[PDB]
Structure formats: C-alpha cells, structure tokens
C-alpha cells in the first residue's frame, strides 16, 4: 500500500497515491466524499463547508450534520450523474470505490484514502495528514492524531493478555471469521487483544465458519459485526448465536459476546479523527 505523497506547486499539489496521480488544488471548495471516516475527519478539522456531496444512503448516526448535503448515493451505489452535476473540484474515495476510479477521475481529481490493514496506524495518519495539508491544517491534525494515540494507550493498558478474542461478521445466517491484519484487524494489531486463532488470515471476505468452530476455539471474547444491520435484513446476530454450542463458550458464560456498532466497524469509519476515537473507546469499554 503506497503512502500518499504530495508536492507543492503553488496553487495546487501534485498528489500520488496507490491508484494514481492527480493535481489537487489548494483549499478545494467542492469536495465529494465517499469514505465515511474521511467525512468525519472533515468535520473534525471544521471543513464542513468544503463538502458538496456525501453518500446519504449510508449516512450513520454520528454524521447527521451532513444530511443537508447533496446525496451522491451510497458507499457502493455511487451516483455518477449526481457527482457530475455538482461539478466538484475533488472526489475522495476509499477501498469500496476503487473499482470506480476511472469513471470518477473523468469528473474530477480523485484522491484515494485506503486503509492498509497490515499497517493501519500509518495509513490512517497519512490519510488525515494529506487531507489536512490541502488546507494548511497540519497542526490541528497532529493534535487530534496525538489524542487518538492517547486513547490507544488507555485501551492497551487495560487489556488482559491471558484472554483471546474471535472476530465474526454475520450476514444473513452466515458467520465469517476475521483475524489479525483483516478489515477488523485493529482489535488485534493496534489494541493488542490476542486472537484465539492467529491462523485465521484473511482480508475483506473472511473464513466461513459455524457454531461448532466457535465452541472448538472457545474464545473469551467474541466481537460481532452484524452486516445485517447495514443491509436491512431480518436476521440478527443475537439470534444466530443464541444456541447451545455458543452458550458453552467462555465468551457466552462471561457475557463477552460484544455486538459492535456496524455503522462504525462495517462502514469502516477508521479514517475519522472522532469516529476512530469512538471505536477505540467501544473496544476498551467492552473489555475493561
Ligand atoms: Fe461490503
């Protein structure tokens, strides 16, 4: 995962990222943001007035200050006609919109703020700082990055190293597991919670598993991300895991099956100076 690089050209920056190269004007004034975390970072840096389009169909509870903005669809259902009609000077995307990069780059300079699951903290810093640098706000960004570092250390200091967690996602009645360096990796990689099974190694899709696997591993914590909440489906993780095999795990018996808010974890708000902070606190409060 290539870090974002910028070179000053007076009125504009020459910007290189994993997907390509763009000329980005300084102080862009009409920004379409498809990544929810970076939307939150815009709010944290007081750049709300620079934003002209957001994915209103997936706008979570903590980003309701952007409901007034023009909708450019959802994080997957990108509305190209809407984006084009706004005439933006900058489009910002993450992993979900990489597939749309060439069409978006025909409308305006398109900055990629991907989170590298193998290098979460560095990519996050580089994403926040590269946005800040467009506006001259490096100093504000560093103070907020330093707040996140502080929250990380508060979380870490409370972790019980004798305990092991499993991370699962639920989608319809299907359960998939995720481990270190996956899309939920920060629970293991940044907050230092031990994985039950270090050998689950996956990215965005996950290992297909069942309630017998979960009992076999017998984790002390189960972190559940229920994709059914995002997709509107009738099935609920709470129903999926209410069975006799899961009931016998240390997790069920100690009431440490923890239902993480998928508006943060699944929508992947990790680029947010305030949303990352809330996710770190959600982990910390679930295990302390
Ligand atoms: Fe998805």
Automatic annotation (TrEMBL):
It comes from Campylobacter jejuni. InterPro entries: ABC_transptr_periplasmic_BD (IPR002491), Bact_iron-sidero_bind (IPR051313), FatB (IPR033870). The keyword Transport applies. Residues 138-165 form a coiled coil. This is Enterochelin ABC transporter substrate-binding protein CeuB. It is found in: Cell envelope. Residues 30-288 form the Fe/B12 periplasmic-binding domain. GO terms for biological process: iron coordination entity transport. Keywords: Coiled coil, Ion transport, Iron, Iron transport, Signal, Transport.
